[PDB]
Amino acid sequence: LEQCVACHSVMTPGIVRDYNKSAHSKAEPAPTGCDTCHGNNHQKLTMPSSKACGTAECHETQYNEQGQGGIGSHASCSSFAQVECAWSIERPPGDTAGCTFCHTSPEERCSTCHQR
Amino acid sequence: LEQCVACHSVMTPGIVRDYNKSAHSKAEPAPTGCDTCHGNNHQKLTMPSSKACGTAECHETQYNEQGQGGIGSHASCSSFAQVECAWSIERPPGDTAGCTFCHTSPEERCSTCHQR
Amino acid sequence: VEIITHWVPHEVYGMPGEPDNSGKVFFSGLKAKYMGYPKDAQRSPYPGKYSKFWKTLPAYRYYIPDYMYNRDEVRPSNPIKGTFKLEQCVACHSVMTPGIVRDYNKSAHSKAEPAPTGCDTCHGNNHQKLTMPSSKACGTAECHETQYNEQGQGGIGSHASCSSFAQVECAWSIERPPGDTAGCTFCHTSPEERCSTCHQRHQFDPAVARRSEQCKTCHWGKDHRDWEAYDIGLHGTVYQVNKWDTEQFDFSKKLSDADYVGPTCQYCHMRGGHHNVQRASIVYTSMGMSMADRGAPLWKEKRDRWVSICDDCHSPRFARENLQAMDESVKDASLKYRETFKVAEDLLIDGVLDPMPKDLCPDWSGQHIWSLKIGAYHDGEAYGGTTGESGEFRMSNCTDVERLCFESVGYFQTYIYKGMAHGSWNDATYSDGSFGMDRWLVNVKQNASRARRLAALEKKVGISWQPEQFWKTGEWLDQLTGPYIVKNHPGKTIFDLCPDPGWLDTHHAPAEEVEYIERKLKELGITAGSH
Amino acid sequence: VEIITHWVPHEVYGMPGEPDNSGKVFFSGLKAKYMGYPKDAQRSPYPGKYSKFWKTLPAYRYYIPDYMYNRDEVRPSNPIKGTFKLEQCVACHSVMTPGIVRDYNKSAHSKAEPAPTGCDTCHGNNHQKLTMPSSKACGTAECHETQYNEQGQGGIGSHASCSSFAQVECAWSIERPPGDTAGCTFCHTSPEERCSTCHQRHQFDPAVARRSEQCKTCHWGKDHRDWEAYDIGLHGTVYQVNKWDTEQFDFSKKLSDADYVGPTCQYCHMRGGHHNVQRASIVYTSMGMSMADRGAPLWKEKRDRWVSICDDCHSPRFARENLQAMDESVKDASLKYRETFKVAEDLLIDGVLDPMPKDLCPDWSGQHIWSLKIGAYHDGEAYGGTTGESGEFRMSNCTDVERLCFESVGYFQTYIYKGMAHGSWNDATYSDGSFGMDRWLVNVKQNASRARRLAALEKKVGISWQPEQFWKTGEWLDQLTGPYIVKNHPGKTIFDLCPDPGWLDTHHAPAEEVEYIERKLKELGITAGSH
Amino acid sequence: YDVKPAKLWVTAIAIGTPIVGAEIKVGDEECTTGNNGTCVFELRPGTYAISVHEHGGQSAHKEVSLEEGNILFVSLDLGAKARHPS
Numbered sequence A, B: 001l002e003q004c005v006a007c008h009s010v011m012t013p014g015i016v017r018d019y020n021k022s023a024h025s026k027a028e029p030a031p032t033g034c035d036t037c038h039g040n041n042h043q044k045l046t047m048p049s050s051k052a053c054g055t056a057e058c059h060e061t062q063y064n065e066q067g068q069g070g071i072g073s074h075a076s077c078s079s080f081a082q083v084e085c086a087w088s089i090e091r092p093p094g095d096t097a098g099c100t101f102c103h104t105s106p107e108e109r110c111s112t113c114h115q116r
Numbered sequence C, D: 001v002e003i004i005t006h007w008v009p010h011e012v013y014g015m016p017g018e019p020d021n022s023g024k025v026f027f028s029g030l031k032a033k034y035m036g037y038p039k040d041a042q043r044s045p046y047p048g049k050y051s052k053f054w055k056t057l058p059a060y061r062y063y064i065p066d067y068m069y070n071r072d073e074v075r076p077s078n079p080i081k082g083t084f085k086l087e088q089c090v091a092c093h094s095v096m097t098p099g100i101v102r103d104y105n106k107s108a109h110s111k112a113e114p115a116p117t118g119c120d121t122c123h124g125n126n127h128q129k130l131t132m133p134s135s136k137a138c139g140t141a142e143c144h145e146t147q148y149n150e151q152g153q154g155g156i157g158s159h160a161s162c163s164s165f166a167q168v169e170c171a172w173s174i175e176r177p178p179g180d181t182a183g184c185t186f187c188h189t190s191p192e193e194r195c196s197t198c199h200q201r202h203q204f205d206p207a208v209a210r211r212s213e214q215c216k217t218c219h220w221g222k223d224h225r226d227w228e229a230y231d232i233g234l235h236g237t238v239y240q241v242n243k244w245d246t247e248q249f250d251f252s253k254k255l256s257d258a259d260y261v262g263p264t265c266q267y268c269h270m271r272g273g274h275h276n277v278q279r280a281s282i283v284y285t286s287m288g289m290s291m292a293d294r295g296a297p298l299w300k301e302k303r304d305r306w307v308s309i310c311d312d313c314h315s316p317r318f319a320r321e322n323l324q325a326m327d328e329s330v331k332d333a334s335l336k337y338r339e340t341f342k343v344a345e346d347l348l349i350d351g352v353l354d355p356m357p358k359d360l361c362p363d364w365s366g367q368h369i370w371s372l373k374i375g376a377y378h379d380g381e382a383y384g385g386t387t388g389e390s391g392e393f394r395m396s397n398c399t400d401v402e403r404l405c406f407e408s409v410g411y412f413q414t415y416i417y418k419g420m421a422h423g424s425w426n427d428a429t430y431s432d433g434s435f436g437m438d439r440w441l442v443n444v445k446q447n448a449s450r451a452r453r454l455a456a457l458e459k460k461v462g463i464s465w466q467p468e469q470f471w472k473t474g475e476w477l478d479q480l481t482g483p484y485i486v487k488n489h490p491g492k493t494i495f496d497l498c499p500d501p502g503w504l505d506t507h508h509a510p511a512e513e514v515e516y517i518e519r520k521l522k523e524l525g526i527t528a529g530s531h
Numbered sequence E: 001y002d003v004k005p006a007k008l009w010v011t012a013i014a015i016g017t018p019i020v021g022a023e024i025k026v027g028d029e030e031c032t033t034g035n036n037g038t039c040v041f042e043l044r045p046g047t048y049a050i051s052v053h054e055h056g057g058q059s060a061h062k063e064v065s066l067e068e069g070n071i072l073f074v075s076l077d078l079g080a081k082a083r084h085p086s
């Protein structure tokens, strides 16, 4: 984790500035660090979805709460509305690029509302 | 310079620990930093020889002093003894690898005697 | 300098044929009936496979204390009687053996709460039925199982097997009379058997254990210049210059949190405080006598892990390429030796070796197998023994050529590996390194030249050269096991006489290591080896 | 590495036939005309039996100062005139030789009341009549008679006789040009003659004298690895790790109160601060070249005393048995040498030794006695010399077989004794110990084989081998005492030419020593030895 | 000395959607997925075989070599046949 922080503190300064402010960094006995969310192997990095945040050991409560939503909620706005979006499928990508960027977020990424 | 120190403090900790102890780091008005000896561009890094240390603005005195040496001195132990070393040339490299590591240092690298 | 035969009271001077164990002065130690080791002295037999031929001294009791001391059939008699409390131990020894109590008192064992780890915890209460605490005693689950188990993780050539394999089944030790090879018992048993290694009894200070010098008392000298290479290298220069400066070397800090200016033996080999000292080693190479390119793609992970250790104070490139130079120096070394062994091998196939193996005093087994014969490379008439069986590799009781080969590979080569590994440039060149192997090759050549020039003359003059009596027998040679076995058990070898399973038979390589090799070999497409 | 014949100005290159003392550079030291030592240089003759043949250098004046400096006939000139007060010595030398005054001012001598032991007290007031203070000067009744007398209690091979016997009657030193063996004068004279030994001038600090390293300057190297054995052993490991930790080693304490974690040379050899360093020694064994079972009942009381010293930090049993192991190593070592010697002796008796002593350059005495001949054991025509007379034991001016024998007993064997005595297991085995003797035995056997094979061939072909000229004469050989005596005093030996009584004539073993041995031999019923 | 165990996340997907009630086998350890479709395993260093089974009859396999203190997220898709009503 030390290495992630040190290297990125210069490479992507803003991310480290944000991380250091976050409760995740201060957590004990062990912090929720870059490696906890992204992995240790730089050749096998991963992007943490809502499923990653919503693990039983972490924030299952919020994941399950959100997941209670029906059609047209934050629970389905990617899986239904966007993944089966008529216009997006119909057209060249880029025509409706913004739709991917907007619709997927609430369901898939918990950096929504509370920014990473 | 800040970036050299911050990144290497974790990547190569010992070097930064050493650097911080050195008078070079404390020098004013401007410190003799990693960039001063190695360069700013990480794709165009350089290793500082005795010539680099012995610049008029820096330690010309010690460079000139050492350079007063004749044959078989610290002034010629690389350029003569090693560069024209019969056995080293004759043999596969590795047979006499140690000779390169030992002979070049006094003449070429001022990290001799006072460690980097 | 003379062999002084004056001044010393005349009445003590030893005369020819008088026992050596009389204690009389024999000048240069000559003309004395070799009486041999006190076979009557109360002691224990060594454990293991070659138990029956293991001649032991009393001193040997302390060195494998589990078998050689703690048994009711082997325990030495003690003048002091009664079963004592801890307060009693401490009161009495504080004047009887004062140094021990000063030590124990300094130790944390004495302060431990609620109950202290006291003399009796490690030795017992009954002063008649006293025990000596082995590694197992320290390494109880209740106590220090962690470090014990860590250490036991070690494979062959480690602190986990250095007694039970390398010593209990030590060729020469068995062959020779004890005392000849006494130092071998005192040095090999310690790490595996006695946890007072590195952190000395009875103080057991981790602070002093974390010091490089601790390793020197074994890792020095003729067949492993570990200390000498480290000490004289720039790491050792840094170490010696700084080791008492607390801003540079703080020995109180645990290795985990250790931020020295330069590395210690422990910093690299006992990284994290891991008691398996071999935990970071790439592959076992018989002391550096066997050859391997450790930089090769096969060992890429293990060499990368090494680069991760150097990483603390150097750029990966610097270390990576430095550890490469070692590999080259290792490869160029085995080149030289191949030419050396060739010159030696030729004299045997040609048969003009002076003398041949069959003429020499029989080896520890009683066989007349070639010295330098490596079983898994050599087979035939001129070699001797069964298929795939090696000779008794040694520097003793053999030709100069056989000697200068062993010397070259088993000493001088090991200065290039350990010399280059540790940053001593001279140990791998001028100081009996590469240039030493050079020297020996010249010496081996000339010693073949002479052996040929002569054996050619004796053919063209028609003399049949008889190997001298001193190759067969001699005052010392006669004391060895070979001559005994030849005479007493004529239709058998030492292996025939000692049938029981060896250490190798019971102790295997870890599964995770075999797996890694197979994976990396198929990964790169390189075939495997034979049996 | 080349013999560099460039860069340096040619004007200073020595050409063939030119004097070596010209100051010109002779490449590889070749082609120079040997001029020898400056015999016009103001100096002193050496004292003792062989004064006439003792070639001396000016520097030697300091080393046996009573005879070589303090006599009016010998005292060197001095550019500074006048007789001075102490204040004047200090003031002038504080600038002229700053370090000496710095040391003096730190010393207790300077602070002493009512009057200080000043420069003048030790050197004199008259600058034209300065003297160098010997051990006799320090050991005056008014001063340090105690330490002088203590040291003086030592027998042969002690600090009491290392100048007067060992050095003053040193065969090799007398035989050779001075400078060849200059180091021997500088090393040997000191303990007996100069009390600046151990506690350096001009500070004379007992605290620095208590440090183990003090002994290393003399007690190291080829023929006595005393320091090396101690240093690398666990005692030396403990020492190096702890020596600067005041809690483990307090050098301010007197040796009577020494409560170290581990022992120092002084702790064992100078028990209680006694200056007779040999006090605890069991029996003199000629540097350990001669052999004795020190663990034999004969020496029970003396061995028990050693156990009393080890007792401080070990159980009696542990120490006793460890020293028993030493005894066994010593006995097994001489077993090997007996085999080695037999090979060499057989070559002489069979007359096939290449060459025989008669064809070598004459020894220091001017005789052709066999190098390895021990007068107490050897007698015959082949050995040479009168009955009971020994040869000049040497590694020089002899055959390889003679040389290797000297090396085996004179170097390697001593590593076993000193090694085992000080706890260096590798010094007793791998590091030129037991296995050193093994290697040399092989080397001797090979050399014997070759010499016998040549002799056999020469007989059959009808060549009578004429020993080469270089065995008899040579640039160095010609400068020795041997050739000079043969040429200039044809019928006589050095003993004839130096008839004065020697050290052995005036110095005998103490009454108590003879008394002890006689008592113990009667007690055990062992026959007394011969002359 | 403490050997820091590796942490392995295994996510079971059916063309994007998480599989609920799938069983993941890693070494000797078993986990039946919740709403996440994700199981977290704490494992000692070594080579392991990951297998994801679901009651439809679809399986996914991956072999993984874990070092000391490794963190790895593994995402295995079992295809459209692994998607079941309700």
Ligand code: HEC
Pocket: C135, C138, C139, C144, C147, C148, C151, C159, C191, C194, C195, C196, C197, C198, C199, C206, C209, C210, C211, C253, C254, C255, C256, C266, C270, C272, C273, C274, C275, C277, E001
């Ligand atoms: C026999 C198998 C052994 C036992 C039991 C123990 N040791 Fe050691 N040891 C060594 C060092 C350099 C240290 C310091 C380690 C560090 O800084 O992390 C230690 C430490 C211990 C400790 C303290 C436990 C702790 O780390 O908190 C214990 C209880 C311990 N050791 C037990 C060095 C060596 C060594 C030299 C090579 C040997 C042979 C052993 N230790 C063996 C044992």
Ligand code: HEC
Pocket: A071, A072, A073, A074, A076, A077, A078, A080, A081, A102, A103, A105, A106, A112, A113
């Ligand atoms: C973009 C990343 C969003 C942010 C930030 C917030 N919401 Fe959202 N919300 C978003 C989408 C794409 C959808 C549904 C799309 C679909 O599948 O039809 C929603 C849904 C809601 C709803 C439900 C609407 C319905 O018709 O039932 C509500 C009430 C809602 N969102 C509220 C809401 C609030 C209060 C937010 C701030 C805290 C918020 N959303 C953030 C996209 C995004």
Ligand code: HEC
Pocket: B071, B072, B073, B074, B076, B077, B078, B080, B081, B102, B103, B105, B106, B112, B113
């Ligand atoms: C290795 C990196 C060295 C260190 C550290 C020191 N010296 Fe050195 N020295 C070294 C070499 C390779 C050579 C000469 C090689 C050659 O071209 O022949 C020298 C030379 C000297 C000399 C001159 C020797 C001569 O024959 O004229 C001296 C007097 C000398 N070195 C002393 C010296 C001292 C005192 C050092 C410590 C402060 C020192 N050297 C460091 C290699 C290295």
Ligand code: HEC
Pocket: C156, C157, C158, C159, C161, C162, C163, C166, C187, C188, C190, C191, C197, C198, C214, C215, C216, C217, C218, C219, C265, C266, C269, C270, C277, C278, C281, C284, C285, C287
């Ligand atoms: C003597 C009592 C020892 C001390 C003190 C230390 N070590 Fe050791 N070590 C010793 C032996 C007898 C052996 C192996 C013998 C054998 O069975 O072949 C070892 C082994 C090692 C190794 C492994 C070498 C290899 O596998 O080829 C290493 C890396 C090692 N030892 C390092 C080491 C260090 C760093 C020590 C000080 C802390 C140390 N050893 C102490 C004997 C002794």
Ligand code: HEC
Pocket: C099, C186, C196, C197, C199, C200, C201, D234, D235, D238, D260, D261, D262, D263, D267, D268, D306, D309, D310, D311, D312, D313, D314, D318, D319, D320, D322, D323, D423
């Ligand atoms: C106290 C000041 C000591 C005296 C006097 C002697 N020894 Fe010692 N010895 C001492 C220590 C602190 C140690 C280190 C203990 C450890 O755990 O390693 C030793 C070590 C030895 C050893 C080697 C260790 C072993 O194999 O057990 C030997 C063989 C040994 N000591 C023997 C010995 C003998 C024979 C002594 C008298 C001449 C002697 N020691 C003196 C502390 C002290």
Ligand code: HEC
Pocket: C212, C215, C216, C219, C226, C227, C230, C231, C235, C263, C264, C265, C266, C267, C268, C269, C281, C282, C283, C284, C285, C287, C288, C294, C306, C418, C421, C422
């Ligand atoms: C780190 C900077 C090291 C220090 C300090 C010491 N050694 Fe080492 N050692 C180091 C390396 C990189 C290697 C080579 C490993 C490889 O296989 O490539 C070694 C080698 C050894 C060995 C042989 C190990 C083997 O063959 O498996 C031994 C026994 C050993 N080193 C011991 C040792 C001792 C006693 C040290 C203190 C003086 C020491 N080493 C210092 C790296 C480093």
Ligand code: HEC
Pocket: B004, B005, B008, B012, B015, B016, B019, B024, B032, B033, B034, B035, B036, B037, B038, B047, B048, B049, B109, B110, B111, B116, C313, C314, C315, C318, C319
């Ligand atoms: C000038 C005074 C220097 C400053 C400031 C820093 N370093 Fe340096 N560095 C210097 C020398 C003379 C050398 C030796 C060069 C050679 O040719 O061998 C170095 C070497 C390095 C290295 C590589 C060698 C190694 O140990 O791995 C690295 C990676 C390095 N230096 C990095 C470094 C950093 C990060 C610094 C800032 C803190 C720094 N150096 C300062 C001279 C000088």
Ligand code: HEC
Pocket: D156, D157, D158, D159, D161, D162, D163, D165, D166, D187, D188, D190, D191, D197, D198, D214, D215, D216, D217, D218, D219, D265, D266, D269, D270, D277, D278, D281, D284, D285, D286, D287
């Ligand atoms: C050189 C100046 C010496 C110093 C410093 C020390 N010793 Fe010595 N020692 C020296 C000589 C030349 C001799 C004897 C030479 C001879 O005449 O044979 C000795 C003798 C001893 C002995 C007796 C050896 C024997 O065979 O009986 C001992 C035990 C001894 N020395 C120990 C010793 C110690 C412990 C010292 C340090 C305090 C020490 N010596 C200093 C030369 C020198």
Ligand code: HEC
Pocket: D135, D138, D139, D144, D147, D148, D151, D159, D191, D194, D195, D197, D198, D199, D206, D209, D210, D253, D254, D255, D256, D266, D270, D272, D273, D274, D275, D277
């Ligand atoms: C090394 C082998 C020594 C030689 C040679 C001499 N001395 Fe020493 N001396 C030595 C030691 C280790 C010590 C300290 C011993 C102790 O008791 O702790 C000493 C001490 C002295 C002292 C101080 C006496 C006291 O009060 O304890 C004196 C005055 C002294 N020595 C004088 C002395 C003289 C006159 C010597 C020449 C004959 C001499 N010493 C030789 C070590 C050694």
Ligand code: HEC
Pocket: D212, D215, D216, D219, D226, D227, D230, D231, D235, D263, D264, D265, D266, D267, D268, D269, D281, D282, D283, D284, D285, D287, D288, D294, D306, D418, D421, D422
């Ligand atoms: C105590 C543990 C010792 C320390 C520390 C040192 N030595 Fe020792 N030495 C010791 C013993 C038990 C013996 C054997 C004596 C015997 O005959 O049983 C020795 C031997 C010597 C000798 C030879 C003396 C002789 O009589 O022939 C010498 C010259 C000697 N030791 C010197 C010496 C020096 C210089 C030491 C410091 C480095 C040293 N010894 C350490 C016990 C101990």
Ligand code: HEC
Pocket: C076, C078, C079, C080, C083, C084, C085, C086, C088, C089, C090, C092, C093, C096, C119, C120, C123, C124, C125, C126, C127, C130, C131, D315, D316, D317, D318
């Ligand atoms: C009286 C004094 C005691 C008491 C009360 C204890 N010990 Fe001992 N011990 C004593 C002596 C004099 C000796 C040495 C005997 C000799 O060799 O001359 C010992 C010896 C030991 C040993 C060493 C045994 C050996 O070398 O093989 C040990 C390990 C030992 N003692 C331990 C010990 C313990 C644990 C005690 C308390 C229960 C204890 N001793 C009491 C003297 C005395």
Ligand code: HEC
Pocket: C107, C108, C109, C112, C117, C121, C122, C133, C134, C137, C138, C139, C140, C142, C143, C144, C195, C196, C199, C204, C205, C206
């Ligand atoms: C159980 C009881 C035992 C046994 C059999 C041994 N020791 Fe230990 N040891 C023990 C305790 C409770 C402590 C105190 C610190 C702690 O709780 O861990 C120790 C201490 C040590 C230390 C560290 C000393 C220090 O930090 O200053 C060492 C290095 C040590 N012990 C080693 C050791 C060895 C080598 C033993 C066998 C010979 C041994 N111990 C026995 C508890 C116990």
Ligand code: HEC
Pocket: C001, C002, C003, C004, D157, D165, D166, D167, D170, D171, D172, D173, D181, D183, D184, D185, D187, D188, D217, D218, D219, D224, D286, D287, D288, D289
């Ligand atoms: C080098 C030689 C030397 C120069 C040539 C001279 C003349 C001597 C004299 C001797 C003699 C004689 C002895 C006695 C032993 C014998 O077998 O003849 C020898 C002893 C010796 C020891 C004692 C070691 C022991 O007894 O255990 C020591 C400490 C010696 C060291 C000096 C040395 C100082 C560094 C140098 C140079 C020589 N010796 Fe010696 N000496 N010596 N020696």
Ligand code: HEC
Pocket: B072, B080, B081, B082, B085, B086, B087, B088, B096, B098, B099, B100, B102, B103, C425, C426, C429, C430, D001, D002, D003, D004
């Ligand atoms: C090992 C060898 C080596 C490897 C092969 C090479 C090529 C050299 C080169 C030389 C030469 C040339 C000299 C000059 C002298 C001559 O006679 O040719 C030699 C000097 C040398 C010294 C100087 C000592 C002095 O002048 O008093 C030093 C300090 C050397 C040490 C290095 C060494 C480092 C540990 C290693 C390896 C070699 N030398 Fe050298 N060198 N050298 N040398």
